Design a binder for this molecule. Sequence first.
Ligand SMILES: Nc1ncnc2c1ncn2[C@@H]1O[C@H](COP(=O)(O)OP(=O)(O)OC[C@H]2O[C@H](NC(=O)C[C@H](N)C(=O)O)[C@H](O)[C@@H]2O)[C@@H](O)[C@H]1O
Ligand SMILES: [Zn+2]
Ligand SMILES: [Zn+2]
Ligand SMILES: [Zn+2]
Length: 262
Amino acid sequence: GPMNNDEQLEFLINYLLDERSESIDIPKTFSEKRNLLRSLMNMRHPSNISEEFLRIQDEFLSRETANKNLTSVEDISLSSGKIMLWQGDITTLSADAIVNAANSKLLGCFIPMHNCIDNIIHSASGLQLREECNRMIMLQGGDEDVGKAKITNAYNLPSKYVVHTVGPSIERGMRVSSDDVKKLERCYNSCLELASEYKLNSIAFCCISTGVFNFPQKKAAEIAIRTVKDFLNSNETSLNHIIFDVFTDKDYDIYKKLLFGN
Ligand SMILES: Nc1ncnc2c1ncn2[C@@H]1O[C@H](COP(=O)(O)OP(=O)(O)OC[C@H]2O[C@H](NC(=O)C[C@H](N)C(=O)O)[C@H](O)[C@@H]2O)[C@@H](O)[C@H]1O
Ligand SMILES: [Zn+2]
Ligand SMILES: [Zn+2]
Ligand SMILES: [Zn+2]
């Protein structure tokens, strides 16, 4: 009969355990049981899975998505021209496309429960995301360079597409080279160019390179804003709304000062 919420969750865990030959007792709460699935999903290198698993995975995750506090693009009220500014979780936002800050293998994040945007996006979207990116890397025959863009379905997310870009990474101790500036520009240009070719009306960016890859937050923002404006000045595009989705208070405050002059 109709497997309810707990019965679906408890199925999926057992599946991934039995494919790695073990079993640990199922924790008490819903919350701890939920993190075990995340953990098992994050850790699973790409390969075939049963259509039964996908179907049920999709029912479970779509439901979770539908029960969050979703935000529509037309409901963001802070805007300057086609640019909007918004603080919130990119997995709650109904844009045509969201941008993922990814790595050169484009497989997402293998640490259980890490809070990088790559893990967060793959954990809400589903295993199909890793599988689709893996088919694209295999056909390309080679890792993805910094500053390009690739597009995929968004699966159980509330958006339609995900755009994957790999930003530059700043070694601990070193200052930012003119070459690193140019590469982070190219991330923004590639993502705009791709969404333009797909004729999308809205895209949401995260603050690429500013977490694990350790780019200074203020300098990143000056670049992101100048690049987006030069692109909108210089091209025709179907884009009406380009959303800087910021996650930390400090990035909110940085972006707010530079866009809305105090
Ligand atoms: N929900 C959210 N919505 C909006 N913005 C958010 C959200 N959450 C965070 N964010 C924000 O997204 C921005 C992007 O930060 P970020 O660290 O995700 O990305 P970054 O571009 O600076 O770095 C990307 C790299 O690290 C990952 N890799 C790992 O984590 C692997 C590891 N080093 C290993 O040893 O195994 C990933 O595969 C790639 O390799 C930040 O401003 C957060 O506040
Ligand atoms: Zn509109
Ligand atoms: Zn991570
Ligand atoms: Zn193209």
